[PDB]
Amino acid sequence: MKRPSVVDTDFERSVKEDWKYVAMVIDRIFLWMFIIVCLLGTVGLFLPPWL
Amino acid sequence: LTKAHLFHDGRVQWTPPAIYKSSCSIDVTFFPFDQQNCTMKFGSWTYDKAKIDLVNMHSRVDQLDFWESGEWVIVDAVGTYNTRKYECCAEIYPDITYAFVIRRLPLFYTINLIIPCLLISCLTVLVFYLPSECGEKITLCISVLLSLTVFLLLITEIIPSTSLV
Amino acid sequence: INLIIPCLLISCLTVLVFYLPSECGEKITLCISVLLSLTVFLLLITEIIPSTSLVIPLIGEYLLFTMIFVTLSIVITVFVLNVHHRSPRTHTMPTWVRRVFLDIVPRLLL
Amino acid sequence: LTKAHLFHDGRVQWTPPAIYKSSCSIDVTFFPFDQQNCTMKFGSWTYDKAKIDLV
Ligand SMILES: *[C@@H]1O[C@H](CO)[C@@H](O)[C@H](O)[C@H]1NC(C)=O
Ligand SMILES: *[C@@H]1O[C@H](CO)[C@@H](O)[C@H](O)[C@H]1NC(C)=O
Ligand SMILES: CC(=O)OCC[N+](C)(C)C
Ligand SMILES: CC(=O)OCC[N+](C)(C)C
Ligand SMILES: [Ca+2]
Numbered sequence: 001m002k003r004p005s006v007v008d009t010d011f012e013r014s015v016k017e018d019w020k021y022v023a024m025v026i027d028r029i030f031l032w033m034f035i036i037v038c039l040l041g042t043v044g045l046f047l048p049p050w051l
Numbered sequence: 052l053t054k055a056h057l058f059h060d061g062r063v064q065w066t067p068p069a070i071y072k073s074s075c076s077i078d079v080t081f082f083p084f085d086q087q088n089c090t091m092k093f094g095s096w097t098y099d100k101a102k103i104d105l106v107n108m109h110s111r112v113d114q115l116d117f118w119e120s121g122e123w124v125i126v127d128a129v130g131t132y133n134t135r136k137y138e139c140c141a142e143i144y145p146d147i148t149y150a151f152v153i154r155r156l157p158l159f160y161t162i163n164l165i166i167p168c169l170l171i172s173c174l175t176v177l178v179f180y181l182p183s184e185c186g187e188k189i190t191l192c193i194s195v196l197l198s199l200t201v202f203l204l205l206i207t208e209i210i211p212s213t214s215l216v
Numbered sequence: 217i218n219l220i221i222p223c224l225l226i227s228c229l230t231v232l233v234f235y236l237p238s239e240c241g242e243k244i245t246l247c248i249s250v251l252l253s254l255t256v257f258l259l260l261i262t263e264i265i266p267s268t269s270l271v272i273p274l275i276g277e278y279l280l281f282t283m284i285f286v287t288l289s290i291v292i293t294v295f296v297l298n299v300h301h302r303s304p305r306t307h308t309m310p311t312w313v314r315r316v317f318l319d320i321v322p323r324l325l326l
Numbered sequence: 327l328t329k330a331h332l333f334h335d336g337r338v339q340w341t342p343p344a345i346y347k348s349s350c351s352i353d354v355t356f357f358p359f360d361q362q363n364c365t366m367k368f369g370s371w372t373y374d375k376a377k378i379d380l381v
Binding site for chain 4: 274
Binding site for chain 2: 238241242243244245248251252255258259262266267268269270272276280283284287290291294295297298300301302
């Protein structure tokens with residue numbers, strides 16, 4: 001992810017936009033973990049029985 | 052107690068109908084793809100082997116006039132002759148045990164339970180892709196949780212309450 | 217009266233989520249309500265019809281396919297909500313998306 | 327097992343009521359506009375065609 005390299009002047013808005021980007025980053029961390037777990041867990045639960 | 056067919060050489064043929072409710076342990080590990088093995092144990096109650104002895108008329112259970120149920124199919128239905136002693140009495144009592152191996156047809160429960168469950172589960176990870184400004188992240192994940200909670204109770208009303216598996 | 221008509225009413229709302237403005241912040245509520253109502257009616261029908269695998273009621277197939285399409289609409293609506301809330305400070309618009317979705321497709325859709 | 331009407335010429339008439347639970351295969355393809363075909367199969371249990379024939 002490449003945060004758009006845009007510069008701000010107002011400090012309060014600038015920070016409130018940094019917080020808004022930390023929230024996005026945290027979501028993407030788990031979006032991968034849950035995607036991986038859902039694919040890994042479901043395969044590791046139903047595949048062995050099918051064999 | 053239907054009539055019996057009596058021949059002139061002493062042979063007697065008796066084929067009464069019956070409706071039996073026999074207890075069989077059910078494993079639901081691979082439900083709705085499970086394969087049940089329910090047995091019936093038949094034997095003379097009072098007469099032991101020295102007095103009444105059973106003979107396997109034919110190992111396979113007759114199925115020519117079997118009524119296709121549409122939900123189960125009998126993979127194998129064979130009777131086994133066994134003899135074993137009981138603490139009641141000193142003699143050997145025989146018995147014939149019929150094992151009905153019935154395989155479930157999974158189309159119905161796949162469409163009504165499995166597929167609806169998958170569709171709800173597909174939405175588990177969508178919440179993380181929503182933008183926090185939408186103000187609907189909680190509605191999405193809460194709805195999924197309750198939806199799955201109900202689906203776990205519907206299954207709880209079908210499968211037996213066995214703790215083995 | 218007791219099954220078909222409510223099912224038709226719920227089906228009439230399947231595509232509405234795509235006409236709701238994103239600012240309303242209630243697309244998700246609508247599509248989730250539609251999905252859960254369809255699932256509830258599928259379960260209600262399940263308790264009436266026999267548990268056979270030889271045939272599938274046409275109503276059952278219709279409800280299942282509507283449920284599938286409502287799930288797809290939920291996915292697409294989540295994507296559209298994510299897109300709608302982008303700004304220069306978080307995402308940068310590629311040239312190709314600008315070109316396409318501001319010149320060609322809007323023109324094609326009148 | 328109601329009473330049977332017996333005539334002087336040896337005829338016997340028996341009209342007893344019955345409440346039968348007959349299994350039939352249900353087709354729900356066109357539910358709730360479906361049409362069912364549920365059968366009841368009656369016949370003598372022990373008397374073959376050479377001892378009792380139904381008309
Ligand atoms: C079914 O059960 C009987 C008795 O419990 C056993 O002898 C037989 O092997 C079983 N068959 C299968 C396929 O499980
Ligand atoms: C009903 O079933 C019987 C035998 O199952 C069949 O002979 C008959 O044609 C069926 N009735 C109709 C209207 O198809
Ligand atoms: C003698 C007698 O009544 O035995 C009954 C019990 N059983 C079937 C275990 C022998
Ligand atoms: C002889 C006798 O009792 O037969 C009963 C079975 N059935 C109905 C198939 C003839
Ligand atoms: Ca709101």
